[PDB]
Design an enzyme around this catalytic site. Structure first.
Site, PDB file in Angstrom:
ATOM      1  N   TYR A   1     -10.196  -3.686  -9.944  1.00  0.00           N
ATOM      2  CA  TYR A   1     -10.143  -2.169  -9.437  1.00  0.00           C
ATOM      3  C   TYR A   1      -8.698  -1.630  -9.828  1.00  0.00           C
TER       4      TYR A   1
ATOM      5  N   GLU B   1     -26.497  13.677   1.285  1.00  0.00           N
ATOM      6  CA  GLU B   1     -27.771  13.627   1.899  1.00  0.00           C
ATOM      7  C   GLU B   1     -29.011  13.143   1.328  1.00  0.00           C
TER       8      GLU B   1
ATOM      9  N   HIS C   1     -27.373  19.761   4.156  1.00  0.00           N
ATOM     10  CA  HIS C   1     -27.516  20.606   2.970  1.00  0.00           C
ATOM     11  C   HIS C   1     -26.549  21.707   2.720  1.00  0.00           C
TER      12      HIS C   1
ATOM     13  N   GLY D   1       0.786   0.913  -3.995  1.00  0.00           N
ATOM     14  CA  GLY D   1      -0.629   0.698  -3.906  1.00  0.00           C
ATOM     15  C   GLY D   1      -1.336   1.713  -3.477  1.00  0.00           C
ATOM     16  N   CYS D   2      -2.384   1.697  -2.323  1.00  0.00           N
ATOM     17  CA  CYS D   2      -3.043   2.816  -2.016  1.00  0.00           C
ATOM     18  C   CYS D   2      -2.793   4.134  -2.108  1.00  0.00           C
TER      19      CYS D   2
ATOM     20  N   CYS E   1       0.838  -1.329   0.032  1.00  0.00           N
ATOM     21  CA  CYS E   1       0.050   0.051  -0.002  1.00  0.00           C
ATOM     22  C   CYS E   1       0.753   1.215   0.092  1.00  0.00           C
TER      23      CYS E   1
ATOM     24  N   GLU F   1      -8.577   1.836 -12.062  1.00  0.00           N
ATOM     25  CA  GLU F   1      -8.113   3.127 -11.411  1.00  0.00           C
ATOM     26  C   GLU F   1      -6.867   3.420 -11.955  1.00  0.00           C
TER      27      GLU F   1
ATOM     28  N   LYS G   1      -1.461   5.601  -5.571  1.00  0.00           N
ATOM     29  CA  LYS G   1      -2.420   5.481  -6.860  1.00  0.00           C
ATOM     30  C   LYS G   1      -3.352   6.437  -6.467  1.00  0.00           C
TER      31      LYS G   1
ATOM     32  N   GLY H   1      -4.518  -9.907 -11.484  1.00  0.00           N
ATOM     33  CA  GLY H   1      -4.661 -10.539 -10.288  1.00  0.00           C
ATOM     34  C   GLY H   1      -3.455 -10.614  -9.512  1.00  0.00           C
TER      35      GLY H   1
HETATM   36  C1  LIG Z   1      -2.597  -1.017  -6.974  1.00  0.00           C
HETATM   37  C2  LIG Z   1      -2.888  -1.372  -5.475  1.00  0.00           C
HETATM   38  C3  LIG Z   1      -3.774  -0.483  -5.068  1.00  0.00           C
HETATM   39  C4  LIG Z   1      -4.357  -0.806  -3.849  1.00  0.00           C
HETATM   40  N1  LIG Z   1      -5.064   0.211  -3.378  1.00  0.00           N
HETATM   41  C5  LIG Z   1      -5.855   0.003  -1.895  1.00  0.00           C
HETATM   42  C6  LIG Z   1      -6.582   0.888  -1.360  1.00  0.00           C
HETATM   43  O1  LIG Z   1      -7.017   1.982  -1.923  1.00  0.00           O
HETATM   44  N2  LIG Z   1      -7.149   0.509  -0.188  1.00  0.00           N
HETATM   45  C7  LIG Z   1      -6.978  -0.801   0.635  1.00  0.00           C
HETATM   46  O2  LIG Z   1      -7.486  -1.007   1.502  1.00  0.00           O
HETATM   47  N3  LIG Z   1      -6.069  -1.546  -0.052  1.00  0.00           N
HETATM   48  C8  LIG Z   1      -5.532  -1.312  -1.209  1.00  0.00           C
HETATM   49  N4  LIG Z   1      -4.625  -2.159  -1.888  1.00  0.00           N
HETATM   50  C9  LIG Z   1      -4.229  -3.552  -1.278  1.00  0.00           C
HETATM   51  C10 LIG Z   1      -3.498  -3.265   0.023  1.00  0.00           C
HETATM   52  O3  LIG Z   1      -2.093  -3.067  -0.660  1.00  0.00           O
HETATM   53  C11 LIG Z   1      -3.306  -4.654   0.847  1.00  0.00           C
HETATM   54  O4  LIG Z   1      -4.581  -5.248   1.094  1.00  0.00           O
HETATM   55  C12 LIG Z   1      -2.263  -4.599   1.852  1.00  0.00           C
HETATM   56  O5  LIG Z   1      -1.166  -3.787   1.613  1.00  0.00           O
HETATM   57  C13 LIG Z   1      -1.926  -6.032   2.357  1.00  0.00           C
HETATM   58  O6  LIG Z   1      -1.140  -5.941   3.567  1.00  0.00           O
HETATM   59  P1  LIG Z   1      -0.194  -7.065   4.106  1.00  0.00           P
HETATM   60  O7  LIG Z   1       0.463  -6.471   5.412  1.00  0.00           O
HETATM   61  O8  LIG Z   1      -1.161  -8.184   4.020  1.00  0.00           O
HETATM   62  O9  LIG Z   1       1.077  -7.140   2.806  1.00  0.00           O
HETATM   63  P2  LIG Z   1       2.076  -5.982   2.405  1.00  0.00           P
HETATM   64  O10 LIG Z   1       1.695  -4.813   2.459  1.00  0.00           O
HETATM   65  O11 LIG Z   1       2.334  -6.510   0.784  1.00  0.00           O
HETATM   66  O12 LIG Z   1       3.374  -6.485   2.929  1.00  0.00           O
HETATM   67  C14 LIG Z   1       4.076  -7.732   2.897  1.00  0.00           C
HETATM   68  C15 LIG Z   1       5.608  -7.444   2.953  1.00  0.00           C
HETATM   69  O13 LIG Z   1       6.210  -8.543   3.187  1.00  0.00           O
HETATM   70  C16 LIG Z   1       7.429  -8.548   2.262  1.00  0.00           C
HETATM   71  N5  LIG Z   1       7.944 -10.058   1.986  1.00  0.00           N
HETATM   72  C17 LIG Z   1       7.507 -10.947   1.109  1.00  0.00           C
HETATM   73  N6  LIG Z   1       7.970 -12.140   1.403  1.00  0.00           N
HETATM   74  C18 LIG Z   1       8.881 -11.989   2.357  1.00  0.00           C
HETATM   75  C19 LIG Z   1       9.847 -12.698   2.994  1.00  0.00           C
HETATM   76  N7  LIG Z   1      10.023 -13.972   2.739  1.00  0.00           N
HETATM   77  N8  LIG Z   1      10.711 -12.203   4.110  1.00  0.00           N
HETATM   78  C20 LIG Z   1      10.226 -10.846   4.486  1.00  0.00           C
HETATM   79  N9  LIG Z   1       9.706 -10.109   3.775  1.00  0.00           N
HETATM   80  C21 LIG Z   1       8.852 -10.633   2.759  1.00  0.00           C
HETATM   81  C22 LIG Z   1       6.854  -8.092   1.210  1.00  0.00           C
HETATM   82  O14 LIG Z   1       7.836  -7.641   0.220  1.00  0.00           O
HETATM   83  C23 LIG Z   1       6.015  -6.817   1.673  1.00  0.00           C
HETATM   84  O15 LIG Z   1       6.961  -5.994   1.909  1.00  0.00           O
HETATM   85  C24 LIG Z   1      -4.060  -1.936  -2.995  1.00  0.00           C
HETATM   86  C25 LIG Z   1      -3.211  -2.835  -3.909  1.00  0.00           C
HETATM   87  C26 LIG Z   1      -2.564  -2.472  -5.139  1.00  0.00           C
HETATM   88  C27 LIG Z   1      -2.004  -3.602  -5.677  1.00  0.00           C
HETATM   89  C1  LIG Z   2     -26.886  33.341   4.028  1.00  0.00           C
HETATM   90  C2  LIG Z   2     -27.597  31.877   4.386  1.00  0.00           C
HETATM   91  C3  LIG Z   2     -27.012  30.644   4.376  1.00  0.00           C
HETATM   92  C4  LIG Z   2     -27.662  29.319   4.650  1.00  0.00           C
HETATM   93  N1  LIG Z   2     -27.128  28.525   4.365  1.00  0.00           N
HETATM   94  C5  LIG Z   2     -27.732  27.101   4.848  1.00  0.00           C
HETATM   95  C6  LIG Z   2     -26.931  26.011   4.435  1.00  0.00           C
HETATM   96  O1  LIG Z   2     -25.994  25.709   3.856  1.00  0.00           O
HETATM   97  N2  LIG Z   2     -27.779  24.789   4.960  1.00  0.00           N
HETATM   98  C7  LIG Z   2     -28.987  24.988   5.600  1.00  0.00           C
HETATM   99  O2  LIG Z   2     -29.678  23.776   5.929  1.00  0.00           O
HETATM  100  N3  LIG Z   2     -29.578  26.038   5.893  1.00  0.00           N
HETATM  101  C8  LIG Z   2     -28.889  27.143   5.527  1.00  0.00           C
HETATM  102  N4  LIG Z   2     -29.528  28.557   5.601  1.00  0.00           N
HETATM  103  C9  LIG Z   2     -30.666  28.319   6.388  1.00  0.00           C
HETATM  104  C10 LIG Z   2     -32.211  28.020   5.355  1.00  0.00           C
HETATM  105  O3  LIG Z   2     -31.899  29.005   4.371  1.00  0.00           O
HETATM  106  C11 LIG Z   2     -33.179  28.398   6.197  1.00  0.00           C
HETATM  107  O4  LIG Z   2     -33.322  27.723   7.360  1.00  0.00           O
HETATM  108  C12 LIG Z   2     -34.329  27.950   5.246  1.00  0.00           C
HETATM  109  O5  LIG Z   2     -34.532  28.792   4.176  1.00  0.00           O
HETATM  110  C13 LIG Z   2     -35.844  28.213   5.986  1.00  0.00           C
HETATM  111  O6  LIG Z   2     -37.064  27.762   5.059  1.00  0.00           O
HETATM  112  P1  LIG Z   2     -38.543  28.204   5.378  1.00  0.00           P
HETATM  113  O7  LIG Z   2     -39.379  27.499   4.582  1.00  0.00           O
HETATM  114  O8  LIG Z   2     -38.466  28.466   6.886  1.00  0.00           O
HETATM  115  O9  LIG Z   2     -38.440  29.828   4.912  1.00  0.00           O
HETATM  116  P2  LIG Z   2     -38.065  30.556   3.715  1.00  0.00           P
HETATM  117  O10 LIG Z   2     -37.202  29.624   2.725  1.00  0.00           O
HETATM  118  O11 LIG Z   2     -37.233  31.836   4.250  1.00  0.00           O
HETATM  119  O12 LIG Z   2     -39.239  30.682   2.545  1.00  0.00           O
HETATM  120  C14 LIG Z   2     -40.321  31.682   3.363  1.00  0.00           C
HETATM  121  C15 LIG Z   2     -40.821  32.421   1.927  1.00  0.00           C
HETATM  122  O13 LIG Z   2     -42.193  33.034   2.342  1.00  0.00           O
HETATM  123  C16 LIG Z   2     -42.175  34.291   1.793  1.00  0.00           C
HETATM  124  N5  LIG Z   2     -42.845  35.143   2.543  1.00  0.00           N
HETATM  125  C17 LIG Z   2     -42.625  35.724   3.688  1.00  0.00           C
HETATM  126  N6  LIG Z   2     -43.517  36.595   4.199  1.00  0.00           N
HETATM  127  C18 LIG Z   2     -44.773  36.227   3.368  1.00  0.00           C
HETATM  128  C19 LIG Z   2     -46.307  36.868   3.048  1.00  0.00           C
HETATM  129  N7  LIG Z   2     -46.647  37.598   3.852  1.00  0.00           N
HETATM  130  N8  LIG Z   2     -46.869  36.154   2.068  1.00  0.00           N
HETATM  131  C20 LIG Z   2     -46.275  35.212   1.142  1.00  0.00           C
HETATM  132  N9  LIG Z   2     -45.130  34.571   1.248  1.00  0.00           N
HETATM  133  C21 LIG Z   2     -44.261  35.400   2.100  1.00  0.00           C
HETATM  134  C22 LIG Z   2     -40.595  35.000   1.982  1.00  0.00           C
HETATM  135  O14 LIG Z   2     -40.179  35.779   1.180  1.00  0.00           O
HETATM  136  C23 LIG Z   2     -39.814  33.473   1.453  1.00  0.00           C
HETATM  137  O15 LIG Z   2     -39.975  33.449  -0.028  1.00  0.00           O
HETATM  138  C24 LIG Z   2     -28.856  29.700   5.364  1.00  0.00           C
HETATM  139  C25 LIG Z   2     -29.315  30.798   5.495  1.00  0.00           C
HETATM  140  C26 LIG Z   2     -28.739  31.937   4.993  1.00  0.00           C
HETATM  141  C27 LIG Z   2     -29.584  33.275   5.356  1.00  0.00           C
END
Ligand SMILES: Cc1cc2nc3c(=O)[nH]c(=O)nc-3n(C[C@H](O)[C@H](O)[C@H](O)COP(=O)(O)OP(=O)(O)OC[C@H]3O[C@@H](n4cnc5c(N)ncnc54)[C@H](O)[C@@H]3O)c2cc1C
Ligand SMILES: Cc1cc2nc3c(=O)[nH]c(=O)nc-3n(C[C@H](O)[C@H](O)[C@H](O)COP(=O)(O)OP(=O)(O)OC[C@H]3O[C@@H](n4cnc5c(N)ncnc54)[C@H](O)[C@@H]3O)c2cc1C
Ligand SMILES: CCn1c(NC(C)=O)nc2ccccc21
Lengths: 588, 588
Positions: free
Chosen positions: A291, A571, A566, A153-154, A149, A295, A157, A387
């Site tokens: 994979y 979500e 959101h 490996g991981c 890895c 990848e 890559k 493999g």
């Molecule tokens: C391209 C690629 C991408 C991967 N990507 C991911 C990923 O994103 N996420 C993930 O979870 N896994 C990933 N894997 C898998 C991951 O690498 C393995 O599951 C993990 O490394 C296994 O760990 P290990 O300790 O069993 O063996 P290894 O990590 O292979 O370690 C064994 C070591 O023992 C050594 N050895 C061998 N024979 C002897 C000996 N006789 N005496 C002494 N030392 C020896 C070897 O040379 C090696 O250094 C990937 C694998 C590959 C090939």
């Molecule tokens: C800058 C900013 C960023 C935000 N970012 C996030 C975020 O990332 N994630 C998140 O979960 N929340 C976020 N919020 C909060 C989210 O926008 C509010 O919690 C949500 O919009 C509440 O919805 P509501 O239906 O209660 O009211 P509103 O969405 O405000 O709707 C009420 C509507 O009724 C209208 N209205 C008012 N009075 C009257 C009336 N008398 N007659 C008719 N229509 C009327 C209003 O003009 C409006 O259009 C953010 C808020 C702000 C200000």
């Protein structure tokens, strides 16, 4: 019952103190250890519910029933007065280094699992050796401590994947108001390899530092288990010697396979060579559909390469095939060419690799499709991803008695024990286990605690989540849809699904209905979530959290009652309502 | 028990069919209704726990005990023969449409919660009206249907956040091998605003299309409840009239406050104006310290602006203050300036907005620090983010008798009912509820099902996860650390924490020990996770999945026994082990 636990703990622990948190005689022993740099495990009897039984059972060993009691490698050493007598008489250090063996624990393999197991055992005073050796690839590629890895490996890559994702960031940037022009920008492969290799080198160094700071002996040597307690080592000079250890952990991993066709070993490469290749591969053929294959093909295309993938039958065998197909459809729409239902017959060399001017060679590939039609094309690089396999007949003499399965992997009990009672196996060579880095680390650490600290917790291998880091990522946890139907029947399975569009894709004019997710549930078990599946950006971050809820037995009602965050992609899972049986379209 | 559920369902549904899946007499009736384009709810009794008791109980209204039975607005209409007699004589439309009121449901407020309630109600046959009106800002800004999130909230601010994140993407691409020079790229505000507003315009249009295709009457008019069943409406020509509805839902949201000081209304702006501003703000002062203030100040700095934030007391009051401080320290290190413990006294105009040449004015801001020292600096734009309030005096006649709290928010029961029995409130104006868009949507969808389809499910308002989208994002679910310590005492609280570094930051030479995460747990309750906190990239995608686990009662051991996905940021939660009480450093 409890007595069988105490006997097993006292026999394998290296240095262990039986204690009570409330006791000052225990604290004065803890203070002497160390003070003398003596690491030890510690069990606090007043923390365990049946500590009263353990206290009584200790007497079968020491003829006494009080705390503190200190053991070394199965032998009772004494109470408070007896330890201090050994301290002030200069006798204590020789007592704690008494052993029938060179080491309490020998780890064969310096990779994800081996390094984790070794560091954890040292923390409880086990005298530990870690062996690691990297047999070169056919063209001679080799690397440093840390395993597949870290080195090939991981880690390299995902870094290259990130380099690929950055190309669409540069594209997306113009739509959001930045002045740059993506069509006037190119990629430099060797600059990227240099930065990746610099980080890998700092991981190599950090592991050698960590073994040093934990008092683990690191031997850059090839290990071979010749009897249950004897490991034969061959070093950098081909000098041979034998060391002994109480417990053995096999953790040697796997290496890539080559198909048995002319030219493969001579003129192609594998992923072992790709992550440090000195020249850009150029026009590339990837042979395989795992994979690893998808990848690597994926990020080479993003970096501007002309890439083809040759697929024997299907993509991502063993994963949900509807998801597999969506993964491939996306890569094909974004540059990767596919040669479907096709296998190679030979590789022929037209140009030798230009090591001076730093350029790839040139090859001719011949093969055939399943209907007999012929395949013939030129490429600069041929990558095999067909493999991986262990070669335990290189680690393990057949006479020791370690049973292997049909594929050459070690058959183990659910506590990692092999057919030989002091020998254990972890990581990729443990037969039937998911082959993944976080699994190998967890297995190694938990085993080290059972061997040397009296722990009991086992590793849980069910429902481990995964992520395939293709240009559009694919994260999953649990069963595929076809596996769930095969196991429970179509009438008991309900599937909720939806398309979605990341908000980041709106202003940048990207596809409306390509990202996709589904929940596969069991009607008769309260609509239990049997598998989760998402195709989209950051799929790994999306999926990880849900794997805790699946572990806990989550149902569709649990997803429904949780409120979303959101604006996020993740979500969409909290409001899923369209079923496949309904026939309603999942577009949005 | 079961009796009065049936009574409540029948008196409230508009068109409801009590049916059975096995019976073809119902299937004959359902098809008659689909052909006549009559929407209705349907209660399948052969798929319910005590469906056999409701069947009996139904006879209290119909004098018959058999299925099917169809009701309109509380009145039994007939069995299978009696309905087809109305279909053959074409008396059916007049019966299903006759109502004491103009509408079964009037929604005042066409935003997140209001649009969601109206559409869900119309599914089950309710005759629904949705009113929306956008009162202009002091400088005259106005927008279309969809509410605060869609037009001036979550959607435009995360899009502008993404334009800011892309700046560091352009920086990172060099280190990954791409050939651009980030030093020579600048940003165009008006290009960004055009892309953002085009997306918002497609959401305005989508909502109007969605309302029409559900047969929902949309009125662009200001609504005022004058009596429990009467709503006075004023259209765009100031034509007054009165409509009537059975059920009323208030969902009118909030608007930004201005501090009571000279110049503020005249010469400053708010977030309502920021997202469609036709000129770049230039050198900007933000007054406030909420998530709106930090989010806006965040992306303005990332787009190259000269930004200052004026903080009265603390950042992110009501959030975990260790996390708030880490947020603000990151902003301060990447170009946001803070004027701490400072308030404004007046805003003076020096230049008028050049509305022809598309340029901001110039302003002089005067204020003082908390010790007594004075503040005086010039800015081109001044943005106030000092909170939001409703103003139900515009919406609600005090004689109707809907109780408000001291803030002006609507006091409701746990099923959203006001003190007047046919009037409900949802969204930001519901007192004490989390002011979030997915909360409003769930609240309004679940209420629509209880009013018109006999549902019983309530909205769960506890442990709703959040994400603050500052340059380094901050996601959270559950209690802050100080809140847990206060409720349970410091000795019953354990906190696991750790820094981390995204893999993507390694090759880009970003900081080692800035991202951070923690689990706040209760010792005496099986180490239950009381709160989760993460600062890092993609924090909303990281947190979301864990909200399901926390909803289900996750403990630290549930996190421990789950395996990580490698390599991701989120996996750091599956291996936490350093406690705050131990005093060991959390660095990597
Ligand atoms: C391209 C690629 C991408 C991967 N990507 C991911 C990923 O994103 N996420 C993930 O979870 N896994 C990933 N894997 C898998 C991951 O690498 C393995 O599951 C993990 O490394 C296994 O760990 P290990 O300790 O069993 O063996 P290894 O990590 O292979 O370690 C064994 C070591 O023992 C050594 N050895 C061998 N024979 C002897 C000996 N006789 N005496 C002494 N030392 C020896 C070897 O040379 C090696 O250094 C990937 C694998 C590959 C090939
Ligand atoms: C800058 C900013 C960023 C935000 N970012 C996030 C975020 O990332 N994630 C998140 O979960 N929340 C976020 N919020 C909060 C989210 O926008 C509010 O919690 C949500 O919009 C509440 O919805 P509501 O239906 O209660 O009211 P509103 O969405 O405000 O709707 C009420 C509507 O009724 C209208 N209205 C008012 N009075 C009257 C009336 N008398 N007659 C008719 N229509 C009327 C209003 O003009 C409006 O259009 C953010 C808020 C702000 C200000
Ligand atoms: C009474 C509110 N009313 C006004 N009034 C003005 C401009 O004085 N403009 C409107 C536009 C749409 C809908 C209602 C409207």
């Amino acid at each position: 019952g409890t007595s069988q636990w105490l006997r097993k703990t006292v026999d394998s622990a290296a240095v262990i103190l039986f204690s009570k948190t409330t006791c000052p005689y225990c604290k004065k022993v803890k203070d002497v250890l160390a003070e003398a740099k003596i690491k030890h495990a510690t069990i606090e009897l007043d923390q365990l519910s049946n500590g009263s039984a353990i206290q009584k059972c200790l007497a079968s060993f020491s003829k006494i029933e009080t705390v503190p009691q200190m053991f070394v490698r199965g032998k009772f050493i004494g109470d408070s007065q007896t330890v201090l007598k050994y301290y002030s008489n200069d006798e204590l250090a020789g007592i704690v280094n008494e052993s029938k063996y060179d080491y309490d624990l020998i780890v064969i393999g310096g990779g994800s699992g081996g390094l984790a197991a070794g560091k954890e055992a040292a923390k409880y005073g086990a005298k530990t050796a870690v062996l690691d050796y990297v047999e070169p690839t056919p063209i001679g590629t080799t690397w440093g401590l840390g395993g597949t890895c870290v080195n090939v490996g991981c880690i390299p890559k995902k870094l290259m994947h990130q380099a690929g994702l950055l190309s669409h960031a540069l594209e997306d940037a113009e739509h959001f108001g930045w002045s740059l022009d993506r069509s006037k920008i190119s990629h430099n492969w060797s600059t990227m390899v240099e930065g990746v290799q610099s980080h890998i080198g700092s991981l190599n160094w950090g592991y050698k530092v960590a073994l040093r700071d934990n008092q683990v002996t690191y031997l850059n040597a090839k290990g071979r288990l010749i009897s249950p307690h004897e490991v034969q080592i061959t070093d950098k000079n081909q000098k041979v010697s034998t060391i002994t250890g109480n417990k053995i952990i096999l953790a040697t991993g796997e290496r890539p396979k080559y198909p048995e066709i002319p030219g493969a070993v001579e003129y192609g490469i594998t992923s072992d060579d790709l992550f440090s290749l000195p020249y850009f591969p150029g026009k590339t053929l990837v042979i395989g559909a795992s994979y690893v294959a998808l990848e690597c093909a994926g990020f080479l295309a993003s970096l501007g390469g002309d890439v083809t993938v040759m697929v024997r039958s299907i993509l991502l065998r063993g994963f949900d095939q509807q998801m597999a197909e969506k993964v491939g459809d996306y890569m094909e729409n974004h540059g990767v060419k596919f040669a479907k239902l096709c296998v190679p017959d030979e590789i022929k060399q037209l140009k030798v690799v230009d090591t001076e001017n730093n350029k790839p060679g040139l090859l001719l590939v011949k093969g055939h499709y399943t209907d007999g039609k012929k395949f013939e094309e030129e490429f600069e690089t041929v990558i095999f991803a067909v493999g991986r396999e262990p070669q335990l007949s290189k680690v393990l003499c057949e006479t020791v008695g370690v049973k292997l399965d049909k594929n050459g992997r070690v058959v183990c009990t659910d506590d990692e024990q092999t057919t030989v009672s002091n020998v254990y196996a972890i990581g990729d060579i443990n037969a039937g286990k998911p082959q993944l880095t976080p699994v190998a680390i967890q297995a190694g650490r938990y085993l080290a605690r059972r061997l040397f600290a009296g722990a009991t917790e086992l590793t849980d291998y069910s429902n481990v989540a995964t992520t395939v880091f293709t240009p559009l990522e694919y994260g999953a946890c649990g069963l595929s849809e076809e596996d769930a139907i095969e196991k429970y029947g179509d009438k008991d399975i309900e599937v909720y699904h939806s398309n979605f569009k990341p908000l980041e894709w709106t202003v940048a004019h990207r596809e409306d209905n390509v990202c996709y997710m589904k929940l596969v549930c069991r009607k008769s078990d309260n609509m239990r979530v049997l598998g989760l599946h998402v195709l989209g950006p950051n799929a790994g971050e999306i999926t990880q959290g849900y794997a805790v809820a699946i572990k806990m037995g989550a149902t569709k009602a649990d997803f429904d009652r949780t409120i979303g965050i959101h604006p996020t992609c993740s979500e969409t899972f909290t409001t899923l309502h369209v079923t496949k049986k309904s026939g309603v379209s999942p577009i949005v």
